[PDB]
Amino acid sequence: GPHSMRYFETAVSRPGLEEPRYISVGYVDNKEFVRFDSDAENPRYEPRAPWMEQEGPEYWERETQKAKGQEQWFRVSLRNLLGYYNQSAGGSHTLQQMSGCDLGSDWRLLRGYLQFAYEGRDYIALNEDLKTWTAADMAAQITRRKWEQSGAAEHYKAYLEGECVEWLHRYLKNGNATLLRTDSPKAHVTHHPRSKGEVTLRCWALGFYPADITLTWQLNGEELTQDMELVETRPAGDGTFQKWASVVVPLGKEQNYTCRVYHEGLPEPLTLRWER
């Protein structure tokens, strides 16, 4: 199956003499596995998934030292941008970066990613060819020219096709069992008063993992997507997710509606209806 690894980095400058705060989060298959935060008492990369405890001290030390360098790189880059955008000091600014690789079914590199944003908007990004850049505005064209001249793309291409792939493979082996785990959703339907002779039937899916899930309401067995109320999937806070979908059903004609829940952990889609 396909897999991925990403590092999401953030640098925020703040009013005063105080230095920016640098935060770096690593993900494997969209699951946080490592994290660094310059605001911490003893700032260093820390494991965020149990299977990373397999790595030795030299790993944490090397990653921590790379983060210290990044914290300085971001300070310099933030100061550079203030000039490109003609901004004075004493403001609040955000620089973000997403970097990583996607592996295909053959577990070979499928696509490399390297992008930046400033104040929450696209700044510059390495194109899929891992050779050229797409600059989002005039200021970024400055960085683009600077990087074409310095040949920065070659550095990122080497990482994306080499290190990124090598380590993603290692992490998948180390957190094998854990990363492919699935917690099937526990589902149930609740009945709500609503209006005049019309009630609300709400289908709940709780305690599932991964977050991917699909809820559907059916009329006598036939799909029913039109006036269905959905809620964005949300963290329960214990590592699992929640989600619900509801419909307003004419009083009495409850038992005619069925809710179907689809999730990778399920041996078969769940099928249920108003109970009680």
Partner: peptide, 9 residues
């Protein structure tokens, strides 16, 4: 394993 920046923006 994280990537590092070399040339600045």
């Amino acid at each position: 394993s994280s990537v590092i920046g070399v040339w600045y923006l």
